[PDB]
Amino acid sequence: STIEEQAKTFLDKFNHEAEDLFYQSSLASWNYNTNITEENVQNMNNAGDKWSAFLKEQSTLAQMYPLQEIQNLTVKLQLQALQQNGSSVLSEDKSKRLNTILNTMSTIYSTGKVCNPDNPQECLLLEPGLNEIMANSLDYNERLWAWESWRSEVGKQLRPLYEEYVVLKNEMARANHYEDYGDYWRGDYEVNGVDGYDYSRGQLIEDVEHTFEEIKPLYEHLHAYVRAKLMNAYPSYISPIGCLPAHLLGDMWGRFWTNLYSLTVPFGQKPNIDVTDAMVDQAWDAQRIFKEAEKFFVSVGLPNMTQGFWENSMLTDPGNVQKAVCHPTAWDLGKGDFRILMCTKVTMDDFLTAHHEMGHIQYDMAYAAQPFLLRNGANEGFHEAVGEIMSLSAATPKHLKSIGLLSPDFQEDNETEINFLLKQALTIVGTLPFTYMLEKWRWMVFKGEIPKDQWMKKWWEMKREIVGVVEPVPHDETYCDPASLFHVSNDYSFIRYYTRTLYQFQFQEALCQAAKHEGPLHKCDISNSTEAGQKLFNMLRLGKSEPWTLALENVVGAKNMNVRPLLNYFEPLFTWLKDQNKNSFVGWSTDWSPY
Amino acid sequence: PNITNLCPFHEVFNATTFASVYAWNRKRISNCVADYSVIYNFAPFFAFKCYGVSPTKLNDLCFTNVYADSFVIRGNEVSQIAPGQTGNIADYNYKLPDDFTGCVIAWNSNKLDSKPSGNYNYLYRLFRKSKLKPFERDISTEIYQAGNKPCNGVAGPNCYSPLQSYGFRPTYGVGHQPYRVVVLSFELLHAPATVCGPKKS
Ligand SMILES: *[C@@H]1O[C@H](CO)[C@@H](O[C@@H]2O[C@H](CO)[C@@H](O)[C@H](O)[C@H]2NC(C)=O)[C@H](O)[C@H]1NC(C)=O
Ligand SMILES: *[C@@H]1O[C@H](CO)[C@@H](O[C@@H]2O[C@H](CO)[C@@H](O)[C@H](O)[C@H]2NC(C)=O)[C@H](O)[C@H]1NC(C)=O
Ligand SMILES: *[C@@H]1O[C@H](CO)[C@@H](O)[C@H](O)[C@H]1NC(C)=O
Ligand SMILES: *[C@@H]1O[C@H](CO)[C@@H](O)[C@H](O)[C@H]1NC(C)=O
Ligand SMILES: *[C@@H]1O[C@H](CO)[C@@H](O)[C@H](O)[C@H]1NC(C)=O
Ligand SMILES: *[C@@H]1O[C@H](CO)[C@@H](O)[C@H](O)[C@H]1NC(C)=O
Ligand SMILES: *[C@@H]1O[C@H](CO)[C@@H](O)[C@H](O)[C@H]1NC(C)=O
């Protein structure tokens, strides 16, 4: 009779038909991903079309319920999620142009082929070849040619496209009652209406800044050490007082530094903790890898895997005749159906990745009871954080000696710990300034703080000032150097990686103090601790029903992002880096002294 | 005397077609011998909860009427077929009284009630003006008027058809698979009790 009861009944109808149509859509997406055939393509397209049609009509019917007179938080959250007009708020011409722009950016990025001059008979694509050269080669001019050529071609062909893209997305956000597209992206972390746990869209930028200001000493020491080792690798091109050359970071863009373990190893004589050999000696098939992951999750207290998980998941590559997408993905079909699509091989990596994806599925299982539109992570960072904590705990020497992959007489000396922490630092601490810089550039270009004719000059300046990476040659506004990355060319939010990185170590400290760990944080394992599994499960079951600040308070006892667990995780490496940077100069200069 | 005229339990727990929970089927059982052992050995049961009588004493007890109520629900709702429970099924589809004397029996029926395109012939009532009284059935398809404006019979905004379909599929999770439920209700009246068990010599 009142608006709130009408909203409850409408949400009940929506939840029922949403779960049915979503299940058909997800089953068709699964059938395309495990069987790439044209009838599966058209089935997936028809199911996706019927789902987007349903979510359109239902959003039209959902906007007749104003939110200011609904007092229940769950109903308010579901209606806030449903009433979003997305790209439909524009005119038909502008919406069609926006979808055309997005599609052509996707096709330029996916089919972008850049090759050597004077040899045009065949050319090299980004995904098969450019990642290899930019991640394995030790030649300066070869990496320079690939880097400059790809950014030159893709930037010249994508700069007017991005020029129209920023305007259309800004109009979309401002028609949707947001300040800019950056505010629209920051709206995922927004919490309104709960006392004490309130979080604003605008608070995220200063929280990220406040964490990064404490990230900066550790990153500076790591940068100095990496710089010194790269100076050993490249003798005259890199300056002691300057920044790193951009095409020497191990990736195409400098996003991850994990490709520099070979050049920047602390102790090359010591081996790593690779346990691939023990798996291949003991004949560990994919099934037993997932069974060991299941045993870990039942050891910590979480539920077993469902029968339909073992029956319906494709945990091995099917063969040559039947083609499937090889990307590791955890699927929440709904209707109690949870699957993992993983082309598992026998490696230490795939084992850790199986722990990661089963962490994703455990997160999806805990929140299943929740209503359909609240079956997600509390924010975009939690879902990957709860998988990365499992990848953290499973890779420890204690856990590997517990399950028999690592010998019981294995000596954990400090040198292999330094080696492990530096590999983890190159993967985790290395991506933080790049992520913060990229998101802050995107936020200012959406906000209009950066002028249109000053894009590259501002971007490179921030790369010199924040990341400590210098450009090889100056670039004018004919180039669109940010857009060479997959996430920015294809309209994806990027701050999730920064938030996930911080939430990962926060969750890890909370579970390790829950499980009574008496050593350094990097050695901690949450196996056989049911109080830690209970502590985590109290956040997993919530889903998106509660604020992400409340879920964070449920696990770590704090309601805001904290950087103290991350720096506490890398504390022995921080002391070691302080010890070996006595002769060298910590910090960088923004001058072009290397190049 | 010779044992004959056994009660037709093989026609309740083994029908080619069960009923939707909104129009749940009720069969009265009288003037026959109650061989509950066939019920026992008829499938592995997800729940054989008996409220008020013990599962064994049944055969040696003699009741006046036995009501067998048969329907199909989803696994998550099997807990709702009990005294004192709430949900969509308990409030709007099938209600047991708080002093219920009888047993509830449920078993999985994926091989019989699940189709891959979706079995859309099992329905349940999602919207009802008031909660159901015990042992009541509503077969009405009247458009549920959830708002203030009259619906006028045609489905439209704030006007929802009350019977929603249980789209059963074989790949669903255990909590969503079709479960066939038979509820045995025993009643005694002033009339001579004519449903008792077998006798031996
Ligand atoms: C989503 O789009 C619809 C359609 O434009 C918006 O509905 C209109 O809202 C304005 C502003 O209150 C009203 O003056 C119109 O009468 C509404 N039209 C209809 C058909 O309802 C809706 O407000 C938008 N919602 C959001 C969150 O952007
Ligand atoms: C968690 O508990 C299990 C079960 O108690 C431990 O597994 C045992 O480890 C001891 C180590 O000496 C063996 O002798 C037993 O045979 C093991 N039992 C089983 C059933 O595997 C396990 O080590 C504990 N710790 C961890 C980190 O998993
Ligand atoms: C993959 O698709 C083909 C299409 O003809 C079909 O024959 C085959 O059975 C499918 N494989 C699986 C595992 O469903
Ligand atoms: C919100 O509604 C749900 C059912 O839709 C109910 O369980 C919950 O208690 C309600 N919350 C409040 C604060 O009334
Ligand atoms: C499921 O978990 C229980 C304990 O939680 C365990 O006893 C049982 O063996 C597990 N199931 C399988 C198939 O291992
Ligand atoms: C490792 O421990 C030994 C023993 O005290 C010490 O001499 C050595 O300096 C340590 N090395 C590092 C890298 O911590
Ligand atoms: C019970 O059902 C099965 C299913 O096929 C059938 O074979 C059997 O004959 C049935 N028994 C009775 C007594 O109806």
Author numbering:
A (entry chain D): 19 to 613
B (entry chain A): 330 to 530
Authors' text:
The XBB.1.5 variant of SARS-CoV-2 has rapidly achieved global dominance and exhibits a high growth advantage over previous variants. Preliminary reports suggest that the success of XBB.1.5 stems from mutations within its spike glycoprotein, causing immune evasion and enhanced receptor binding. In late 2022, a recombination occurred between Omicron sub-lineages BA.2.75 and BA.2.10.1 resulting in a new variant XBB.1 and its further sub-lineage XBB.1.5, the latter of which rapidly became the most dominantly sequenced lineage in the United States. We find that while the XBB.1.5 maintains a high binding affinity for human ACE2 as similar to previous variants, it has a diminished affinity for mouse ACE2, representing a departure from earlier SARS-CoV-2 variants.
